[PDB]
């Protein structure tokens, strides 16, 4: 029932390695049975029922079962379970290519579109047909048989390369050993949580909860340099070899399909549409940010010269890569009086979660209830049921997986586990999502204390969760966050604005010790500090976007050299000789290839909506929130990103708010 929860989450998280292997085989056999049955139909016999509906049905069944098999590699604490899951992901990804390349299916979907009364089928069914045909042409199914076999072979290889690329980074366990003195200015609660060695030194890993604290706060330049050298050489040799195969393969299939570059190929599926629009977008933003980057680099260099003088260190006269985070942190402390380590005392994780959940219950018209004795993949994971506040409709459930552990996905992400689409019997499937982040553990007898940037990440990922749960579509392939890649960051970055509002920040904070609120003075400074270091921070994102475009435009370039080129030309901070940041650039292998610009591209839209609609009417306004839910989140991928923006804004979006939000107007 749309108003019950029992039995609607069919996901199981107690699978052994053998069951993951067995279920993978069974899923492939059963799913191929449907595709073979459709392909056996005479072309004159295809109907909506025996072709489109049968395919839509097996698509929702397949993707939910696939979730139980390819998700454990990210969260299970059992290493053999993670391996069986990665192995299953390899098999099912090859199977996905096989089924997508079937010419007998393509011809029947084309015949169906050409012969059915398109005015009399649901708009999303019309979209299903045209998107399926477009995908078929992007797999070469309209081209001769020899080129199809060639594309299929390269797709399978590219899939194994991408999975290996991210697997290498995910399982890397590099660590460095530092004495207490070499960790100067790092706080006791950080140092006491480190693993000790026999020589009374400390182990520091390259994971994010170790790397960035050292880079932000350690006052020993040699310590920062060694950490940066190691962090930006992770998997250097094996992932360089992968890129030297993967990037040319992307160019070759793109050229076989008729596209000039791989970037042209992927841009066609994005709201930006063309690579020349991406180039103009990045280059114009870079020009506007240039004087900001110059002023920030000049202030950082003066800070470094003073600190090297006042402490006796040597002064090389430049900003090295391992100096950037340290002096950006200094800039924030000096110009906005923000001590992140003091501020985190006011964001204990239970207070943040409560405030986060209450904010979006009120704004989006939802109610969240935590489930007791929930079936979860790890003891620390919690489960929540999401109901529509007004009607009681059970929209979905989400898991919160908040703390680090060995073998866990070590960045931040939201995973769609069940689509909120229609089922074979006409009922609606309950959406399921998982928020997977690595927040600080409770230490020193205190609860987990979140820095403001962790609160921001918490809101960012919860925006994705809300997109996955509120989206309701007829077809699984348009469900959840299956929008354009340069549009999927719109709902996540949208919610970030609620952590830069004074009244909202008051509801998110309470001192862990005495329960007191943040002082009004510090609250105002925290909100005003949003633009601190915005020049170099945004210029760095432009570097990454330009590098991603370039590697997928000219496939002959040395990746490390092209990264170094844009660092000095755009960021003004040279890449460390001997590093290879692209070899660690997991976005290149995780669905953001040629599309990393989409983060900045999305932020234009989210800033336009927040400024034009939420700041104007009040950011907790329930009917603006409901319009946001209905017009941006609820359609999922069943509408073009630009159509949903137009539906919400009642106009074309523009850059005015984004520029104002950055200090550029």
């Amino acid at each position: 029932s749309s108003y019950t929860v029992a039995g609607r989450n069919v996901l199981r998280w107690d699978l052994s390695p053998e069951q993951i292997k067995t279920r993978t085989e069974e899923l492939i056999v059963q799913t191929k049975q449907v595709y073979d049955a459709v392909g056996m139909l005479g072309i004159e016999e295809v109907t909506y029922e025996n072709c489109l509906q049968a395919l839509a049905d097996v698509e929702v069944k397949y993707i939910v079962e696939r979730t139980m098999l390819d998700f454990p590699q990210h969260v299970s604490s059992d290493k053999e379970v993670r391996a069986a899951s990665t192995e299953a992901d390899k098999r099912l990804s090859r199977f996905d290519i096989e089924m997508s390349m079937r010419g007998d299916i393509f011809e029947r979907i084309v015949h169906l579109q050409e012969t059915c009364d398109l005015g009399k089928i649901k708009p999303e069914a019309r979209r299903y047909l045209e998107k399926s045909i477009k995908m078929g042409k992007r797999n070469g199914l309209h081209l001769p048989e020899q080129v199809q076999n060639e594309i299929k072979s390269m797709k399978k290889r590219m899939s194994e390369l991408c999975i290996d690329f991210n697997k290498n980074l995910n399982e890397d366990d590099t660590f460095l050993v530092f004495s207490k003195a070499e960790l100067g200015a790092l706080p006791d609660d950080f140092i006491d949580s480190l693993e000790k060695t026999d020589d009374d030194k400390y182990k520091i890993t390259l994971k994010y909860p170790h790397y960035f604290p050292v880079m932000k706060k350690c006052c020993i330049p040699e310590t920062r340099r060694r950490m940066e050298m190691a962090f930006n050489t992770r998997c250097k040799e094996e992932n360089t070899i992968i890129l030297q195969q993967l990037l040319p393969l992307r160019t070759k299939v793109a050229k076989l399909l008729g596209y000039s570059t791989h970037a042209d190929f992927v841009l066609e599926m994005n709201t930006a549409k063309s690579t020349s629009r991406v180039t103009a977008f990045l280059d114009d933003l870079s020009q506007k940010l240039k004087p900001l980057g110059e002023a920030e680099r000049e202030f950082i260099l003066n800070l470094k010269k003073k600190e090297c003088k006042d402490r006796g260190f040597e002064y090389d006269g430049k900003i090295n890569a391992w100096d950037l985070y340290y002096y950006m942190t200094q800039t924030e402390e000096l110009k906005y009086s923000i001590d992140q380590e003091f501020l985190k005392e006011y964001f204990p994780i239970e207070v943040v979660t409560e405030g986060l959940l209450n904010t979006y219950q009120e704004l989006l018209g939802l109610s969240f209830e935590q489930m007791t004795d929930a079936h979860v993949w790890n003891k620390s994971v919690t489960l929540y049921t999401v109901k529509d506040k007004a009607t009681g409709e059970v929209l979905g459930q989400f898991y919160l997986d908040l703390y680090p552990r060995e073998g866990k996905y070590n960045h931040a992400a939201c995973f769609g586990l069940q689509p909120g689409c229609l089922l074979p019997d006409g009922s609606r499937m309950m959406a399921v999502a998982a928020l997977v982040v690595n927040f600080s553990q409770p230490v020193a007898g205190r609860p987990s204390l979140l820095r403001h940037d962790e609160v921001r990440t918490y809101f960012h990922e919860f925006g994705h969760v809300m997109h996955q749960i509120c989206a309701q579509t007829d077809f699984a392939r348009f469900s959840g966050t299956n929008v354009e890649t340069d549009f999927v960051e719109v709902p996540s970055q949208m919610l970030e604005n609620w952590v830069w509002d004074v009244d909202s920040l008051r509801r998110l904070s309470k001192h862990y010790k005495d329960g007191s609120p943040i002082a009004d003075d510090l609250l105002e400074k925290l909100v005003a500090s949003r633009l601190v270091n915005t020049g170099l921070l945004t210029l760095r994102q432009i570097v990454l976007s330009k590098v991603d475009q370039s590697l997928h435009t000219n496939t002959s370039l040395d990746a490390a050299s092209e990264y170094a080129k844009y660092c000095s030309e755009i960021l003004g901070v040279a890449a460390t000789p001997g590093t290879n940041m692209p070899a660690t650039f997991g976005h290149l292998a995780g669905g953001y290839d040629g599309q990393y610009y989409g983060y900045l591209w999305s932020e234009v839209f989210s800033m336009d909506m927040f400024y034009s609609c939420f700041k104007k009417e009040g950011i907790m306004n329930p009917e603006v929130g409901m319009k946001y839910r209905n017009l941006i989140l609820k359609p999922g991928g069943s509408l073009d990103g630009m159509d949903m923006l137009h539906n919400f804004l009642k106009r074309e979006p523009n850059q005015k708010a984004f520029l104002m939000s950055r200090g550029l107007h």
Binding site: A412, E489, S492, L544
Partner: peptide, 7 residues
């Protein structure tokens, strides 16, 4: 698979 910024 929807992840954030690489810092």
């Amino acid at each position: 698979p929807r992840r954030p910024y690489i810092l």
